[PDB]
């Protein structure tokens, strides 16, 4: 039987990978980091409260100008916020109200969203007509589209619930690159700062590092015990952190190809919806199901602070590109800005 | 106050956007959200044409009441990752064929379509997001089941069934077996209706169940409930 021989070879390869990871690990991040000063207590106050959504807010994204926001809720409305003045720049009515992701273009020209309609809809913000119209609708996913991220005005990577990540060409609307290999539904997505690689967290308790220009998985990261719902690169692009339903955040390194540190507490038992990093990467912000965001010392696994003030589950997180503020969205139809 | 002309005009635009958002929310608050569920293509389509590829939107108005019925068919993924989106629906319309008690699902060996429907109903009814959400259970294809129960007994489906091979007793037994999967009888109600291929009063049953759910909601507002 060739199938049993190939299963034995796959088991041998997995054991070789595990042995190479074990032999390459000598001193953990705790053992080197325990000799530096902690960050103390990180206290943040709600500076703005963005009201106007009427259903559970499922996603958000910050602008690269660190002032403009976009948020998605089950109202069927994509509201673009001026976070400095608490002003609604745009309100985009959606064809499908079951939106679970939204992205904002780095140029600021476009907004994507997607959800249970299996379609990433690109919206042209800066039109000659003065309204926000659909640029195009990207179809081809057979499952719910769980995350989308703009590379530029013409390239976008969309995570989806068909156990498949996909890279699209917005000029043609065609499936440029298909990323396959995940067993469970892919729930999160995060682009590298140079947009050369990206990581995806799925429901197979695994994270995979893909290359955009070759379209095939480089490394696979395991260690979680439940469905990964959040993922985010470290700011230099050489590491990333995940968040799953087992109330643990794990930090993984691309070069070491290992898990470095678990950010978990005994008093936290609920799942993690959103994971975001600060500008320096020293603080890891994670949104949980117990209605608040916990700031973690990303180098020491210490609870640096708690961002409490949401009446329902914190579903989405976002730190501005200048690191000035963190914005938490939640199921109680509110967005809050913190400093 | 300490605002420019463009700042004041942007604030005015934001207030207009807030006004349109409030009107849209008030329009959507009077609509009835229904989640349509069932094990495969069993009776969803006949029910849909009786009132009227990702999620399917079905819009119909009955007695000056607008209904939003969502079909999550062909969403072949983990249900728990998107079933919390329908936490605030008015009721769940669960469609079950009565004639597939002896048919096989053909996806798994020795798998019954009826038992797959029981397992899906057990997962949906006792879900954490549907603790207080009522279920309008529809038992599709009663005439086909009535004419085929003479040829094939129900004991091949339920080994512990010892009643007569009649339509009424076995149909009541199937309804009781589906209602026994509700472990939250103190906080939710299951409405069961038997529907034929061409049955006109299906909408009225949905309207009555939705009206009972709306009465339950109305009471809470007065605190009375």
């Amino acid at each position, epitope marked *: 039987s060739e199938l049993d021989q190939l299963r034995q070879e796959a088991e041998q390869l997995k054991n070789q990978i595990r042995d190479a990871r074990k032999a390459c690990a000598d001193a953990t991040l705790s053992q080197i980091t325990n000799n530096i000063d902690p960050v103390g207590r990180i206290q943040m106050r709600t500076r703005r409260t963005l009201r106007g959504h009427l259903a559970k807010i499922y996603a958000m994204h910050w602008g690269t100008d660190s*002032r*403009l926001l976009v948020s998605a809720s089950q109202d069927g409305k994509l509201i673009i916020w*001026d976070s400095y*003045t608490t*002003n609604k*720049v*745009h309100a985009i009515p959606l064809r499908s109200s079951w939106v679970m992701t939204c992205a904002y273009a780095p140029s*600021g020209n476009y907004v994507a969203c997607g959800g249970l309609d299996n379609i990433c809809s690109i919206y042209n913000l800066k039109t*000659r*007509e*003065g*309204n926000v119209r659909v640029s195009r609708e990207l179809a081809g996913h057979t499952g719910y589209l769980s995350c989308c991220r703009f590379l530029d005005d013409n390239q976008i990577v969309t995570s989806s619930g068909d156990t498949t990540c996909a890279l699209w060409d917005i000029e043609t609307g065609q499936q440029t690159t298909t990323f396959t290999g995940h067993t469970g539904d892919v729930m999160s997505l995060s682009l590298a700062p140079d947009t050369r690689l990206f990581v995806s967290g799925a429901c197979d308790a695994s994270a995979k590092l893909w290359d955009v220009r070759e379209g095939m998985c480089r490394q696979t990261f395991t260690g979680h015990e439940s469905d990964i719902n959040a993922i985010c690169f470290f700011p230099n692009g050489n590491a990333f952190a995940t968040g799953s339903d087992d109330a643990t955040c794990r930090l993984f390194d691309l070069r070491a190809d290992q898990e470095l540190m678990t950010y978990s507490h005994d008093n936290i038992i609920c799942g993690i919806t959103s994971v975001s990093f600060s500008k320096s990467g020293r603080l890891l912000l994670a949104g949980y199901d117990d209605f608040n965001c916990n700031v973690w010392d990303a180098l020491k696994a210490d609870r640096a602070g708690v961002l409490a003030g949401h009446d329902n589950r914190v579903s989405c997180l976002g730190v501005t590109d200048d690191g000035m503020a963190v914005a938490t969205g939640s199921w109680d139809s509110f967005l809050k800005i913190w400093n | 106050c*300490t605002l*420019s*002309a*463009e*700042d*004041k*005009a*942007a604030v*005015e*635009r934001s207030k*207009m956007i807030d006004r349109n958002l409030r009107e849209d929310g008030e329009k959507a608050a009077r609509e009835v959200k229904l989640l349509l569920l069932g094990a495969g293509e069993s009776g969803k389509n006949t029910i849909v044409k009786q009132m009227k590829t990702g999620i399917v939107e079905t819009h119909f108005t009955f007695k000056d009441l607008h209904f939003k019925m969502f079909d999550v068919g062909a969403q072949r993924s983990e249900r728990k990752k998107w079933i919390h989106c329908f936490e605030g629906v008015t009721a769940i319309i669960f469609c079950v064929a009565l004639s597939d008690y002896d048919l096989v699902l053909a996806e798994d060996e020795e798998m019954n379509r009826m038992h797959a429907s029981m397992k899906l109903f057990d997962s949906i009814c006792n879900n954490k997001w549907f603790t207080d959400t009522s279920i309008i259970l529809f038992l599709n294809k009663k005439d086909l089941f009535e004419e085929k129960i003479k040829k094939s007994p129900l004991t091949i489906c339920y080994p512990e069934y010892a009643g007569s091979n009649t339509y009424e007793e076995a149909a009541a037994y199937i309804q009781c077996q589906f209602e026994d999967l509700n472990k939250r009888k103190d906080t939710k109600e299951i409405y069961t209706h038997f529907t034929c291929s061409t049955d006109t009063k299906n909408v009225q049953f949905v309207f009555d169940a939705v009206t009972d759910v709306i009465i339950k909601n109305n009471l809470k507002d007065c605190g009375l409930f």
Partner: single-chain antibody
Framework: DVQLVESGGGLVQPGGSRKLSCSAS????????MHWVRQAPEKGLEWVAYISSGSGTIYYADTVKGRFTISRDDPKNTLFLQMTSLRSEDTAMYYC??????????????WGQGTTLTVSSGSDIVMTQATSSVPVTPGESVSISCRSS???????????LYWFLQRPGQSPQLLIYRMSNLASGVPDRFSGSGSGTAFTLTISRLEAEDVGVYYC?????????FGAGTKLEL
């Protein structure tokens, strides 16, 4: 395409009443605030009236306030300027101007072709241009300077300075909308700069396509005041 067509102009006896219409097509008329800007035969842009989106805010120039009436009907995309008691100084070519206001928006971006109406026979921000007409060689850089009585820099960091170019026999177009921001469809050879009350507009590698009268307008506070107009010749 975005188009604004004006109508209703003509010869009017003094003290008469006429109504101007501005039919809008090719854009979402309801979401745009709308301005009336007239230009007398002496070649000077003058702001007349403004109506916001939703008709919630209406402003008038001090010379037409209580005597002109601006209104819009968003169902049919028409802007109205009901004028009563017309005197000889109202003889001007009235432009219907399109302007939207949000963060990063470009107001005064589209101007209509204008309708010509003929009448027979203190605290404002003064906008000053030192040069009224200068000759320029094509292919060479030119600078148009503008000054303001009040500082146009606001507390929010925006300097509300607008640059308009009006070619001969054409409606004015927007070039720079906040003292540095290049407009849409205008070449990168137009650049604006300045600080406080001193302003400049640089046109490197000038062509015959740039020949016209250049106006500086402030949008810090109403009424909106234009410059005298710097004309480029040769």
């Amino acid at each position: 395409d975005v188009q604004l067509v004006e109508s209703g102009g003509g010869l009017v006896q003094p003290g008469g009443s006429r109504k101007l219409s501005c039919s809008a097509s090719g854009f979402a008329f309801s979401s745009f605030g709308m301005h009336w800007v007239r230009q007398a035969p002496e070649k000077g842009l003058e702001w007349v009236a403004y109506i916001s989106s939703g008709s919630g805010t209406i402003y008038y120039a001090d010379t037409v306030k209580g005597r002109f009436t601006i209104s819009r009907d968003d169902p049919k995309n028409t802007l109205f300027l009901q004028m009563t008691s017309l005197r000889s100084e109202d003889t001007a070519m009235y432009y219907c101007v399109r302007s939207i206001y949000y963060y990063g928006s470009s107001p005064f971006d589209f101007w209509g072709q204008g309708t010509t109406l003929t009448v027979s026979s203190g605290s404002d921000i003064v906008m000053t241009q030192a040069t009224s007409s200068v000759p320029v060689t094509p292919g060479e850089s030119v600078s148009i300077s503008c000054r303001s009585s009040k500082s146009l820099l606001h507390s929010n960091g925006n300097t509300y300075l607008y640059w308009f170019l009006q070619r001969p026999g054409q409606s004015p177009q927007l070039l720079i909308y906040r003292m540095s921001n290049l407009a849409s469809g205008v070449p990168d050879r137009f650049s604006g700069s300045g600080s406080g009350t001193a302003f400049t507009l640089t046109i490197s590698r000038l062509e015959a396509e740039d020949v016209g009268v250049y106006y500086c307008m402030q949008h810090l506070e109403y009424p909106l005041t234009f410059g005298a107009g710097t004309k480029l010749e040769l």
